[PDB]
Design a protein around this ligand. Structure first.
Ligand SMILES: [Cl-]
Ligand code: NA
Length: 148
């Protein structure tokens, strides 16, 4: 009954790959590459899929950084967000980005903090803080069964 989501913390030389997105209406929000788990996939693969679909970069997950369980008061919806850190290992500017993505770009911590009011949720900042705090957990905490 909570919605399972995934998000990627992608840091390269003290900048983070984030998206500016319009989730509803017209307002631009800042967020990690992120989205809902879909049937038929593992959580780690959902994370890589979201990075590719939202940014046009391919992702190599390395660690779990945290799992966040919260309720968005504005939409009454409870989420369980599995957040991973990893590398980006390819980029192709012609890859189509999901509708609703304005642009994907690299932001420094100062820029992210100054944009706090337009963060999609409080988790945008929290996920980065936890990553910066050295929170790194093995991917193999998760065991997926594909149904073979
Ligand atoms: Cl919990
Ligand atoms: Na395993």
């Amino acid at each position: 009954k909570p919605n399972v989501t995934v998000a990627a913390v992608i840091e390269q030389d003290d900048k983070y790959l984030l998206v500016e997105e319009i989730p509803r209406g017209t307002a631009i929000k800042l967020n990690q590459p992120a989205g809902h788990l879909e049937p038929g996939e593992s959580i780690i693969q959902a994370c890589s899929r979201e990075v590719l679909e939202e940014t046009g970069h391919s992702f190599l997950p390395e660690v779990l950084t945290g799992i966040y369980h919260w309720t968005c008061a504005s939409n009454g919806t409870t989420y369980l967000r599995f957040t991973f850190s990893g590398q980006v290992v390819s980029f192709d500017p012609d890859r189509k980005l999901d509708t609703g993505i304005v642009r994907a770009a690299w932001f420094s911590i100062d820029e992210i903090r100054a944009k706090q009011a337009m963060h999609r949720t409080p988790l945008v900042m929290q996920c980065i803080e936890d990553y910066h705090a050295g929170k790194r957990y093995p991917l193999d905490i998760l065991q997926y069964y594909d149904g073979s």
